[PDB]
Amino acid sequence: SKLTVVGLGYIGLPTSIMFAKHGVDVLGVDINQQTIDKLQNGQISIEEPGLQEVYEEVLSSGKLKVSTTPEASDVFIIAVPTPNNDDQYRSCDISLVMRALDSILPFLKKGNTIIVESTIAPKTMDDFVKPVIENLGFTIGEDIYLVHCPERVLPGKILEELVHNNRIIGGVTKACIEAGKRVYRTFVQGEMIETDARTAEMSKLMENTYRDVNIALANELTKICNNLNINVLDVIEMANKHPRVNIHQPGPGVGGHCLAVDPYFIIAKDPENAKLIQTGREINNSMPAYVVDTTKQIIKALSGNKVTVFGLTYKGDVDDIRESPAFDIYELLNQEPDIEVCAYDPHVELDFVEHDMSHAVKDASLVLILSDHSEFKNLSDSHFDKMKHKVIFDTKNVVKSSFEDVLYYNYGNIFNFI
Amino acid sequence: SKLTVVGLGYIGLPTSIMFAKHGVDVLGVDINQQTIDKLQNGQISIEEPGLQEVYEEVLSSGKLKVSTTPEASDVFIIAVPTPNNDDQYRSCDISLVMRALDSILPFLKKGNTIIVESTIAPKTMDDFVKPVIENLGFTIGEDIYLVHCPERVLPGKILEELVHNNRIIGGVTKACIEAGKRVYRTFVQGEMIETDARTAEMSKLMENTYRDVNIALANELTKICNNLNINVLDVIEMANKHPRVNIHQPGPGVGGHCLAVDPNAKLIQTGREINNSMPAYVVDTTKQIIKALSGNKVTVFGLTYKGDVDDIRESPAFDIYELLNQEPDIEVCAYDPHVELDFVEHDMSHAVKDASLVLILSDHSEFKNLSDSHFDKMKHKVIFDTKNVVKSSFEDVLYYNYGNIFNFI
Numbered sequence: 042s043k044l045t046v047v048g049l050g051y052i053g054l055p056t057s058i059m060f061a062k063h064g065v066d067v068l069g070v071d072i073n074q075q076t077i078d079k080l081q082n083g084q085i086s087i088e089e090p091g092l093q094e095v096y097e098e099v100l101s102s103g104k105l106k107v108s109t110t111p112e113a114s115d116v117f118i119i120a121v122p123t124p125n126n127d128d129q130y131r132s133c134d135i136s137l138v139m140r141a142l143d144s145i146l147p148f149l150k151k152g153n154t155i156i157v158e159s160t161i162a163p164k165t166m167d168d169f170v171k172p173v174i175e176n177l178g179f180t181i182g183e184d185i186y187l188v189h190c191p192e193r194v195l196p197g198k199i200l201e202e203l204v205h206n207n208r209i210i211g212g213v214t215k216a217c218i219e220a221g222k223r224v225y226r227t228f229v230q231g232e233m234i235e236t237d238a239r240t241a242e243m244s245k246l247m248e249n250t251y252r253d254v255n256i257a258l259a260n261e262l263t264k265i266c267n268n269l270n271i272n273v274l275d276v277i278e279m280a281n282k283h284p285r286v287n288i289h290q291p292g293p294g295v296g297g298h299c300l301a302v303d304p305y306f307i308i309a310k311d312p313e314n315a316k317l318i319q320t321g322r323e324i325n326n327s328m329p330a331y332v333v334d335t336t337k338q339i340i341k342a343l344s345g346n347k348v349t350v351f352g353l354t355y356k357g358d359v360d361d362i363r364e365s366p367a368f369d370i371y372e373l374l375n376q377e378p379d380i381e382v383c384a385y386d387p388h389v390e391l392d393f394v395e396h397d398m399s400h401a402v403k404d405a406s407l408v409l410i411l412s413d414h415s416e417f418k419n420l421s422d423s424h425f426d427k428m429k430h431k432v433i434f435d436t437k438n439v440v441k442s443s444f445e446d447v448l449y450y451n452y453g454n455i456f457n458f459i
Numbered sequence: 460s461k462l463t464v465v466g467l468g469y470i471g472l473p474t475s476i477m478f479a480k481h482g483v484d485v486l487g488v489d490i491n492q493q494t495i496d497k498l499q500n501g502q503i504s505i506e507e508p509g510l511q512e513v514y515e516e517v518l519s520s521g522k523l524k525v526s527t528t529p530e531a532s533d534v535f536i537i538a539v540p541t542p543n544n545d546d547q548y549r550s551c552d553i554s555l556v557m558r559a560l561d562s563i564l565p566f567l568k569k570g571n572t573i574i575v576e577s578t579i580a581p582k583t584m585d586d587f588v589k590p591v592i593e594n595l596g597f598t599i600g601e602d603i604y605l606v607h608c609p610e611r612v613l614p615g616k617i618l619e620e621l622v623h624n625n626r627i628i629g630g631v632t633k634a635c636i637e638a639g640k641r642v643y644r645t646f647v648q649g650e651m652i653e654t655d656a657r658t659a660e661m662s663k664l665m666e667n668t669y670r671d672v673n674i675a676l677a678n679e680l681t682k683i684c685n686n687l688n689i690n691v692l693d694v695i696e697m698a699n700k701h702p703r704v705n706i707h708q709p710g711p712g713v714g715g716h717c718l719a720v721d722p723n724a725k726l727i728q729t730g731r732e733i734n735n736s737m738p739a740y741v742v743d744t745t746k747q748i749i750k751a752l753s754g755n756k757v758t759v760f761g762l763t764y765k766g767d768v769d770d771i772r773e774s775p776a777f778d779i780y781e782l783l784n785q786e787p788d789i790e791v792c793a794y795d796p797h798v799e800l801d802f803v804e805h806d807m808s809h810a811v812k813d814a815s816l817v818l819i820l821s822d823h824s825e826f827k828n829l830s831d832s833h834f835d836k837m838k839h840k841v842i843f844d845t846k847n848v849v850k851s852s853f854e855d856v857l858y859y860n861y862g863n864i865f866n867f868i
């Protein structure tokens with residue numbers, strides 16, 4: 042009957058709004074007072090079209106109340122962030138999840154369900170959540186239910202995505218699985234995949250890992266192809282004609298998300314068993330410097346120091362500068378003497394970011410494309426008129442419009458310039 | 460028209476037979492006299508089902524002649540081996556390809572086509588083959604045509620695949636591509652992908668690389684999952700529900716093949732190192748199963764890399780068998796219906812008679828539907844399936860795979 046959502050960001054706030062929309066009494070919990078003040082003043086703390094309207098209905102119905110403190114509840118959902126650890130492997134930091142678990146503990150009653158929606162390293166539910174709960178007068182699958190249901194939201198379609206997506210319900214016990222289904226049954230029309238907590242954890246991280254290792258492969262191949270005057274993009278397209286070959290696209294590096302590596306067991310106790318993952322991460326981490334070295338060479342062959350960075354985010358059409366290879370390049374270029382850097386991103390609202398394109402491209406020798414923003418797809422020679430040299434090095438292969446005055450380069454043909 | 464095929468193995472001999480079957484005058488060239496004597500006596504030097512029959516027709520028609528020496532021809536196809544160098548990568552050795560090229564050079568005439576079917580590192584056609592030919596006065600795309608046409612056939616289906624498989628025609632010039640198409644149009648019904656030589660070389664290296672790195676990922680994940688008491692197979696099936704996630708299947712290793720790089724490539728190297736470590740990982744797991752049980756006898760099921768194929772070359776399954784054979788305190792016995800050898804035991808029942816563990820290393824069709832009746836002679840009815848091939852559910856036999864071996868310990 043009552044649900045507490047701990048963490049009111051991109052995951053937690055729409056989720057709280059969703060259960061409250063279906064008649065559940067929801068208490069939204071966040072440690073950020075600025076967030077709580079915004080919410081208590083009737084405004085959503087996140088940027089999502091149409092959500093403000095839904096929030097207004099739900100706030101007025103008295104179904105969604107907010108606080109900096111948890112309170113007694115039937116269901117608790119942890120949707121706090123899992124920052125990236127300062128380590129090679131890029132392990133998920135479970136510290137905010139454990140801090141959030143400790144806020145919930147004094148309010149725990151028999152029959153309660155704890156759902157962890159945040160990204161967690163494999164064996165977190167079993168080896169970290171379970172011992173803490175069992176330390177209190179509790180038995181998992183009997184007194185309380187422990188579910189890991191990984192939450193992943195599609196921006197622009199968050200609420201629809203929350204209803205129609207297939208969902209993984211990872212219970213510690215078979216009883217926990219049933220408790221998880223009970224919770225989501227409220228609005229989830231999508232399929233509910235039943236499994237244990239460790240399988241749910243491992244699976245989501247394996248998705249991230251397949252993607253990282255494959256991007257590392259593409260990036261490593263780009264370096265090889267550039268050395269041999271081979272077009273990497275044409276060869277990936279060629280090789281992918283094999284039904285079981287799916288080579289990924291290269292880029293300026295990898296950001297956001299964390300991998301299938303627990304900080305302890307497979308780093309501190311058996312690291313040679315995560316050798317491929319480590320190598321993949323090393324290759325992806327080296328791409329900002331590879332882009333910078335390529336930039337330095339373009340700027341050497343041309344008159345000028347001005348490089349205009351286009352995009353400071355990892356994903357396109359997102360305002361997230363957090364753990365961004367595009368920002369890493371900008372900062373390296375800024376640090377670098379003999380290079381005058383100017384960032385352009387329509388999605389990024391920072392002070393230092395140039396808001397106008399024409400002003401940003403003004404007297405620049407090179408336009409550096411580091412994000413695949415929709416705006417960058419349809420760019421004509423008209424946009425680059427103010428440049429000292431009309432040259433583009435696109436690390437994302439986003440520009441789909443052909444030019445004449447402007448010299449356009451990919452990872453596929455950058456070797457032609459040098 | 461006349462064609463010379465240099466190197467008469469699994470690639471060259473069927474290719475020789477194929478062009479001659481279509482009316483081309485073919486000279487098969489091989490440096491091995493034993494091979495030439497076998498061929499000249501009327502017998503194929505290679506093991507492939509109905510090939511002997513097609514060889515007999517073609518030899519009698521006078522369309523396929525063999526020799527240890529090349530002779531003047533319109534087309535030359537190099538199908539010699541590219542052995543593994545030593546080398547931390549076990550990179551492709553281009554030496555036999557270059558030697559084959561050197562043996563053809565004195566016979567070269569204006570208008571000739573040189574096709575390299577052998578595995579070659581990117582830029583071989585452009586930086587190694589082209590300079591040698593141009594040194595003779597020949598102009599590529601004008602008086603000599605240079606093509607890389609990587610050949611890849613499935614044993615048992617060799618002649619069928621030569622016709623029906625799609626083909627990459629990698630010409631040094633656009634004229635070279637046209638010359639390559641005229642050669643293969645003789646019998647190729649499959650699609651002919653037109654591209655330049657460097658794209659054909661790189662594309663072949665990228666296919667094997669995507670495959671190896673991904674198998675390495677699956678195998679590395681299996682080691683991680685086993686350490687955390689997580690089922691790897693269930694997790695791959697779970698994760699692969701994502702439309703852009705295609706995690707491969709783990710196994711006992713990969714059928715060894717040279718890396719077509721010129722002797723950073725750090726990821727590629729690591730991937731091959733992980734796959735090479737799988738035979739020892741399987742052996743270490745086997746040693747632990749045999750420790751917990753009474754007995755020394757382990758029955759290997761499958762000695763081939765590919766299921767339902769005579770794939771014993773650089774086979775990980777075969778490598779495990781020999782490691783188990785070498786290992787004292789372990790009595791190994793191999794069972795494979797597809798492989799005929801001096802050590803391949805009496806048809807199943809006698810191979811299991813007092814064994815404490817059945818180790819499945821190949822995904823043969825026969826291994827899918829398997830009753831308890833088959834293992835009725837074993838000292839301990841236990842199965843460790845490194846391929847996840849057994850689909851027939853059974854009682855009294857303890858079935859283990861990569862996903863649950865941590866349960867036995």
Ligand SMILES: NC(=O)c1ccc[n+]([C@@H]2O[C@H](COP(=O)([O-])OP(=O)(O)OC[C@H]3O[C@@H](n4cnc5c(N)ncnc54)[C@H](O)[C@@H]3O)[C@@H](O)[C@H]2O)c1
Pocket residue numbers: 047048049050051052053070071072073076120121122123124137140141144158159160161192193194195
């Ligand atoms: N956004 C996604 O679709 C996405 C995708 C995959 C995984 N995830 C997982 O979910 C996590 C959170 O995602 P998000 O985008 O909503 O992050 P977010 O930063 O937008 O929101 C997190 C919120 O939780 C609050 N918070 C932090 N610690 C707290 C605590 N101890 N108690 C109560 N509130 C606390 C923060 O103040 C912030 O408002 C991610 O870090 C990841 O683990 C998110």
Ligand SMILES: NC(=O)c1ccc[n+]([C@@H]2O[C@H](COP(=O)([O-])OP(=O)(O)OC[C@H]3O[C@@H](n4cnc5c(N)ncnc54)[C@H](O)[C@@H]3O)[C@@H](O)[C@H]2O)c1
Pocket residue numbers: 465466467468469470471488489490491494538539540541542555558559562576577578579610611612613
């Ligand atoms: N078998 C395949 O489908 C496969 C797959 C991918 C690539 N390849 C490439 O093709 C190569 C050959 O494959 P294979 O399986 O036919 O090898 P193979 O060993 O079966 O046949 C090679 C034959 O060439 C002969 N030979 C060696 N050097 C020669 C020379 N200098 N002049 C004339 N003849 C010579 C050898 O005596 C041998 O008979 C491989 O090493 C690899 O480069 C083969």
Ligand SMILES: O=C(O)c1cccc(C(=O)O)n1
Pocket residue numbers: 193194195196356
């Ligand atoms: O299935 C996906 O890849 C996915 C799903 C939701 C959000 C995102 C994302 O934000 O990248 N990605």
Ligand SMILES: O=C(O)c1cccc(C(=O)O)n1
Pocket residue numbers: 193248249252701703704
């Ligand atoms: O969590 C994700 O969004 C994810 C994981 C692997 C691949 C992809 C993808 O291709 O979008 N996305």
Ligand SMILES: O=C(O)c1cccc(C(=O)O)n1
Pocket residue numbers: 356
């Ligand atoms: O459409 C998507 O789901 C998407 C697109 C780009 C990146 C990702 C990702 O990283 O998950 N996901």
Ligand SMILES: O=C(O)c1cccc(C(=O)O)n1
Pocket residue numbers: 611612613614765
């Ligand atoms: O497309 C493939 O994977 C393939 C094609 C032909 C032969 C072989 C083989 O012999 O392994 N593999």
Ligand SMILES: O=C(O)c1cccc(C(=O)O)n1
Pocket residue numbers: 283285286611666667670
């Ligand atoms: O050479 C091959 O047989 C090959 C190369 C890449 C992928 C695959 C495959 O998925 O079978 N096979």
Ligand SMILES: O=C(O)c1cccc(C(=O)O)n1
Pocket residue numbers: 670765766
């Ligand atoms: O049927 C095939 O092509 C096949 C089967 C198993 C392995 C491979 C491979 O490694 O290419 N290819």
Ligand SMILES: [Eu+2]
Pocket residue numbers: none
């Ligand atoms: Eu995605």
Ligand SMILES: [Eu+2]
Pocket residue numbers: none
């Ligand atoms: Eu294959």
